[PDB]
Amino acid sequence: PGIVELPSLEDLKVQEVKVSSSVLKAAAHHYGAQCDKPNKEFMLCRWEEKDPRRCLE
């Protein structure tokens, strides 16, 4: 069959959220309030495209 098309290592570079899970859980409710819109854009794109490669940006 066909060749699988993977994005490059440069296309996967991003500034990571390098905090622990307790930091995330402590900030979680205000993070779900304040960062609502790009999160829901991403999860809508992620459930509609059904492909992580189409959801990178």
Binding site: M43, R46, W47, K50, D51, P52
Partner: protein, 63 residues
Amino acid sequence: DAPEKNYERTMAILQIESEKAELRLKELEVRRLMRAKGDGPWFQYPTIDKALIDHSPKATPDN
């Protein structure tokens, strides 16, 4: 019986039995084709009903 009566009764018998024979030959050929190709109303063995599929958004996206 008159010979006319037996004669034309024989013709009615021959027409009925020849039509039944032609229908039996066509029935054999139809059964052969429908078993071979599967495109007729006969030999329709079941597949899974697609109405059983859940099309809701699942817990994970990639599905």
